[PDB]
RNA sequence: UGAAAUACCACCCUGGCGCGGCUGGGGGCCUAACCCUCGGAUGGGGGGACAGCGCUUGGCGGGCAGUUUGACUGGGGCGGUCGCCUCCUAAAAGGUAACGGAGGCGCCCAAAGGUCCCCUCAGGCGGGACGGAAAUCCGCCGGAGAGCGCAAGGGUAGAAGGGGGCCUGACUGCGAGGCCUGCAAGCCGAGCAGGGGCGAAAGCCGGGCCUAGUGAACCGGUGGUCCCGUGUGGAAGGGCCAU
RNA sequence: ACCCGGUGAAAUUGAACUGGCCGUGAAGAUGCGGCCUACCCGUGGCAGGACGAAAAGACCCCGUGGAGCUUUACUGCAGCC
RNA sequence: GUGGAGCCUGGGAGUGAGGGCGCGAGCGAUAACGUCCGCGUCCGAGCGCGGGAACAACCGAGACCGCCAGCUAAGGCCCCC
RNA sequence: GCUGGGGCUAGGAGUGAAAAGCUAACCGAGCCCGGAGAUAGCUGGUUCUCCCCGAAAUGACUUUAGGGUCAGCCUCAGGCG
RNA sequence: GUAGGGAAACCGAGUCCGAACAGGGCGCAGCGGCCGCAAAGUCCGCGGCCGUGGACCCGAAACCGGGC
RNA sequence: UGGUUCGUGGAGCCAUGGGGGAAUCUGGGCGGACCACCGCCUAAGGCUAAGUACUCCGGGUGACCGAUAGCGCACCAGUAC
RNA sequence: GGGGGGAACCUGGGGAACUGAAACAUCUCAGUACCCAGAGGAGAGGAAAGAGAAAUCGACUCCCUGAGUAGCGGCGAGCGA
């Protein structure tokens, strides 16, 4: 039967035009009071997942 | 942080938004903090006050 | 005459009383639902609006059911340990094991932070009321053996130590380029913009001499934003920034 | 039990032309080394060896295996209030 | 320095029980065919070949095939040889 | 007390002067068929030929430790040079 | 497939963060002689490997349903 | 409580075990809590071909088997046992 | 008139567990297996108190697509209009 889109990945991640995989930096969900502003700010960006980890996530998204 | 070293937010006294989180010791510093900080909203320094986290 | 003033009529309160409606709780009684029972039954007797039984509430409940009950380990158990920091092992780059040798963390500081200015230690000898090995004072020697909140190490007086003044950069928006590295993390960061602090200025300031003082995601709370809003306007609910 | 006539199984079996010592070897060797010994093939007997046979060790540990049982483990259910 | 070198993108793995030895340590008892790291090696996968009596990892040496030819390696040259 | 005949009670159930005994020659939950090709991170087994290359037994993390994910190391195709 | 960026509204060779015309993230840009040639892409075949199925074959102890 | 993609969610819709309980178009249900507006539709009675499923049965056809195959059975087989 | 039978198919009433979640309880397996009742050559459904945004469509069934979309989800494994 056809493959299913993994909804947890669909909800965390985006495949960019050239097929990199992009996600939010981890670590500002909470426990933030003593984090510097450099930290909070930088954790506010997206990052490009390491190739082996991205290639795996990509196969979970067969129809994006 | 402990029961006595608490966390707290600082609020633009002019625009009322909480802009900075920080900490203090309430045995040594029982009075509410007041600090001049840059308000990103009001776009200038503003006295900010300790307001409960 | 007091805030308001008088006879007389209303709309309505404080509290309380007697009739009544309507009810909530208790008590007594009744019979006819319902239950038991009686050679006899459209009836008699007994219980009786309880009990039973339906729906729902909360509780007790190994009687039964489904399961869970960590890893390391000179077998396993017992004991010990599990993350983070410092030293050694570590074979003069980095890294490097053992239930190898030794210690620490799970905080703290509104100053113990920024900046300007000033100051310099421990210890030894000699001198000095109470005053001593050691309190404070004077002299000479004294490069760091003292200090640096806490373990250790590295660092450090040409200050990171000690005192004072003004202060909140213990910024907001970003961030060239790197360290480290399986990932994810962790770390350092010049520079530009905004609005500031200190300084005459050069300049310094995006916490703390440094390396521990910590916890991904999911779910949820609170403040903000005003981005989505299930025909439409709202609303519910969510997203986003902060925590 | 043995011998003759009659009938005639079995587990087990990689194949086998299947000695002893001292060594060696995955640490207990017929099978390797060196030596020693030994003509070919049976029958009755003995059980030291072939780590003899049987049984994918039952002890022990391991598997995020199973089941029976317990309780102030967790969660639920019957039952009862 | 042109090598079954290197670098980049991608397809497919397997492995994630190692072991001996030499040197450097720790642990152990300046014990173990002990244990645990480091650098190297070999066996693993070279139980193919020569030497070491025999013998995975000690010495010699990396077996494409054939030869009743030659030279050597370690080790040997009295007989077994 | 023993015994014939005729009956009744069964699977989380019966029955038990109690041994977890017995319930059709193995009962800590009978047997048959079915879900069913349950699941087995374990053991076993995996079949023609030639040619080239050719590993690993480590690190990180892991209810993980004889299982995995990533990295390391092998191999193929394309590119660079 | 021919456009991406953004949680989104939305804008678009840009867009997001931002006060920024700053900086940054993620994006955008064939050969020969108009003809041929190659190509994005896509369709079909073939092969390797992956996912879902019992998924290389054989093997439990068990669990559940209905019967005997 | 069930049904739906919807597992309590902002949870409507359809259905209904318990309680309460209407109206007859100026009535009612619905468009995902709710409200307004704007629309859609007529619950609590019943029936209804065809296009769909299957293959005991008959026929046709196989880059289907060929007696360890193919149905369990080519044969007196759901038989012997 | 009923009763009983019929390989699958069909509707309705009931309704597991292994397993998956690399443990497990919600969740999955699955309204599947299976028991039962009923129908029939089919059965069910069917002529809007529908859909759901089109100023629209126009009973039901069945195939393709929409779409692994929207969503649902210890937001896990997965489930899926
Ligand atoms: Mg999710
Ligand atoms: Mg975060
Ligand atoms: Mg969290
Ligand atoms: Mg947040
Ligand atoms: Mg939050
Ligand atoms: Mg800090
Ligand atoms: Mg900061
Ligand atoms: Mg802060
Ligand atoms: Mg921000
Ligand atoms: Mg699509
Ligand atoms: Mg695309
Ligand atoms: Mg009475
Ligand atoms: Mg009476
Ligand atoms: Mg009576
Ligand atoms: Mg009475
Ligand atoms: Mg009552
Ligand atoms: Mg009754
Ligand atoms: Mg109630
Ligand atoms: Mg209850
Ligand atoms: Mg139990
Ligand atoms: Mg209990
Ligand atoms: Mg029991
Ligand atoms: Mg289970
Ligand atoms: Mg547990
Ligand atoms: Mg556990
Ligand atoms: Mg263990
Ligand atoms: Mg031990
Ligand atoms: Mg072990
Ligand atoms: Mg050990
Ligand atoms: Mg031992
Ligand atoms: Mg051992
Ligand atoms: Mg213990
Ligand atoms: Mg920790
Ligand atoms: Mg070192
Ligand atoms: Mg060192
Ligand atoms: Mg070193
Ligand atoms: Mg070295
Ligand atoms: Mg390095
Ligand atoms: Mg230990
Ligand atoms: Mg300790
Ligand atoms: Mg001061
Ligand atoms: Mg300081
Ligand atoms: Mg100062
Ligand atoms: Mg002195
Ligand atoms: Mg003196
Ligand atoms: Mg004196
Ligand atoms: Mg003195
Ligand atoms: Mg010192
Ligand atoms: Mg201390
Ligand atoms: Mg001032
Ligand atoms: Mg960088
Ligand atoms: Mg990195
Ligand atoms: Mg300035
Ligand atoms: Mg400035
Ligand atoms: Mg000035
Ligand atoms: Mg700076
Ligand atoms: Mg300090
Ligand atoms: Mg510190
Ligand atoms: Mg941190
Ligand atoms: Mg979760
Ligand atoms: Mg989790
Ligand atoms: Mg949330
Ligand atoms: Mg609306
Ligand atoms: Mg709006
Ligand atoms: Mg609506
Ligand atoms: Mg309005
Ligand atoms: Mg609006
Ligand atoms: Mg409003
Ligand atoms: Mg809102
Ligand atoms: Mg909001
Ligand atoms: Mg946020
Ligand atoms: Mg004779
Ligand atoms: Mg005879
Ligand atoms: Mg022979
Ligand atoms: Mg012989
Ligand atoms: Mg020996
Ligand atoms: Mg032997
Ligand atoms: Mg021997
Ligand atoms: Mg012999
Ligand atoms: Mg021989
Ligand atoms: Mg011999
Ligand atoms: Mg011999
Ligand atoms: Mg002899
Ligand atoms: Mg004999
Ligand atoms: Mg014998
Ligand atoms: Mg005998
Ligand atoms: Mg023997
Ligand atoms: Mg014997
Ligand atoms: Mg034996
Ligand atoms: Mg045997
Ligand atoms: Mg077996
Ligand atoms: Mg065994
Ligand atoms: Mg065993
Ligand atoms: Mg046992
Ligand atoms: Mg054991
Ligand atoms: Mg066990
Ligand atoms: Mg476990
Ligand atoms: Mg395990
Ligand atoms: Mg278990
Ligand atoms: Mg069990
Ligand atoms: Mg009782
Ligand atoms: Mg080349
Ligand atoms: Mg090579
Ligand atoms: Mg190579
Ligand atoms: Mg392949
Ligand atoms: Mg692998
Ligand atoms: Mg492996
Ligand atoms: Mg392993
Ligand atoms: Mg290992
Ligand atoms: Mg091993
Ligand atoms: Mg090795
Ligand atoms: Mg090793
Ligand atoms: Mg040896
Ligand atoms: Mg070694
Ligand atoms: Mg030597
Ligand atoms: Mg050594
Ligand atoms: Mg050492
Ligand atoms: Mg000795
Ligand atoms: Mg060893
Ligand atoms: Mg040794
Ligand atoms: Mg040793
Ligand atoms: Mg080695
Ligand atoms: Mg091997
Ligand atoms: Mg060799
Ligand atoms: Mg080799
Ligand atoms: Mg060989
Ligand atoms: Mg040799
Ligand atoms: Mg030799
Ligand atoms: Mg020789
Ligand atoms: Mg050799
Ligand atoms: Mg060669
Ligand atoms: Mg010669
Ligand atoms: Mg020589
Ligand atoms: Mg010789
Ligand atoms: Mg009798
Ligand atoms: Mg009798
Ligand atoms: Mg009888
Ligand atoms: Mg009898
Ligand atoms: Mg009985
Ligand atoms: Mg019975
Ligand atoms: Mg029965
Ligand atoms: Mg049973
Ligand atoms: Mg019983
Ligand atoms: Mg008895
Ligand atoms: Mg039987
Ligand atoms: Mg039996
Ligand atoms: Mg029996
Ligand atoms: Mg028995
Ligand atoms: Mg059982
Ligand atoms: Mg059972
Ligand atoms: Mg059956
Ligand atoms: Mg199944
Ligand atoms: Mg299966
Ligand atoms: Mg299992
Ligand atoms: Mg097993
Ligand atoms: Mg095969
Ligand atoms: Mg080769
Ligand atoms: Mg390893
Ligand atoms: Mg990890
Ligand atoms: Mg762990
Ligand atoms: Mg864990
Ligand atoms: Mg395993
Ligand atoms: Mg790999
Ligand atoms: Mg390489
Ligand atoms: Mg490769
Ligand atoms: Mg190439
Ligand atoms: Mg840009
Ligand atoms: Mg062409
Ligand atoms: Mg093409
Ligand atoms: Mg693949
Ligand atoms: Mg299957
Ligand atoms: Mg299969
Ligand atoms: Mg497969
Ligand atoms: Mg099986
Ligand atoms: Mg059994
Ligand atoms: Mg069970
Ligand atoms: Mg059971
Ligand atoms: Mg049963
Ligand atoms: Mg039964
Ligand atoms: Mg309801
Ligand atoms: Mg439901
Ligand atoms: Mg929800
Ligand atoms: Mg709903
Ligand atoms: Mg109802
Ligand atoms: Mg109307
Ligand atoms: Mg109305
Ligand atoms: Mg309605
Ligand atoms: Mg309604
Ligand atoms: Mg409505
Ligand atoms: Mg509607
Ligand atoms: Mg409608
Ligand atoms: Mg009908
Ligand atoms: Mg017709
Ligand atoms: Mg039809
Ligand atoms: Mg047909
Ligand atoms: Mg036919
Ligand atoms: Mg034929
Ligand atoms: Mg035959
Ligand atoms: Mg046959
Ligand atoms: Mg034949
Ligand atoms: Mg036939
Ligand atoms: Mg047959
Ligand atoms: Mg036959
Ligand atoms: Mg027959
Ligand atoms: Mg009937
Ligand atoms: Mg019939
Ligand atoms: Mg049904
Ligand atoms: Mg019925
Ligand atoms: Mg049902
Ligand atoms: Mg049941
Ligand atoms: Mg289950
Ligand atoms: Mg299964
Ligand atoms: Mg699965
Ligand atoms: Mg499971
Ligand atoms: Mg599992
Ligand atoms: Mg288990
Ligand atoms: Mg389960
Ligand atoms: Mg399954
Ligand atoms: Mg289901
Ligand atoms: Mg059914
Ligand atoms: Mg069936
Ligand atoms: Mg019938
Ligand atoms: Mg028809
Ligand atoms: Mg019909
Ligand atoms: Mg009909
Ligand atoms: Mg009609
Ligand atoms: Mg589409
Ligand atoms: Mg389902
Ligand atoms: Zn402000």
Swiss-Prot record, chain A:
Top-level taxonomic group: Bacteria
SUPFAM superfamilies linked to this entry: L35p-like
Keywords: Ribonucleoprotein, Ribosomal protein
One annotated Gene Ontology cellular component of this protein: cytosolic large ribosomal subunit
UniProt record, GO biological process: translation
A single GO molecular function term of this UniProt record: structural constituent of ribosome
Keyword Ribosomal protein: yes
Record's subunit section: Part of the 50S ribosomal subunit.
Family classification: Belongs to the bacterial ribosomal protein bL35 family.
Name of protein: Large ribosomal subunit protein bL35
Phylogenetic classification of the source organism: Bacteria, Thermotogati, Deinococcota, Deinococci, Thermales
Gene designation per UniProt: rpmI
Swiss-Prot record, chain B:
Record keyword Phosphoprotein present: no
GO cellular component, one term: ribonucleoprotein complex
Keyword Transferase recorded: no
UniProt KW keywords: Ribonucleoprotein, Ribosomal protein, RNA-binding, rRNA-binding, tRNA-binding
Domain of life, source organism: Bacteria
One GO term of the biological process aspect: translation
Alphabetical list of InterPro entries matching this protein: Ribosomal_bL33, Ribosomal_bL33_CS, Ribosomal_bL33_sf, Ribosomal_zn-bd
A GO molecular-function descriptor: tRNA binding
Recorded coiled-coil stretches: none
Subunit structure: Part of the 50S ribosomal subunit.
Family affiliation: Belongs to the bacterial ribosomal protein bL33 family.
Protein purpose: Found on the solvent side of the large subunit.
Name assigned to this protein: Large ribosomal subunit protein bL33
Organism: Thermus thermophilus (strain ATCC 27634 / DSM 579 / HB8)
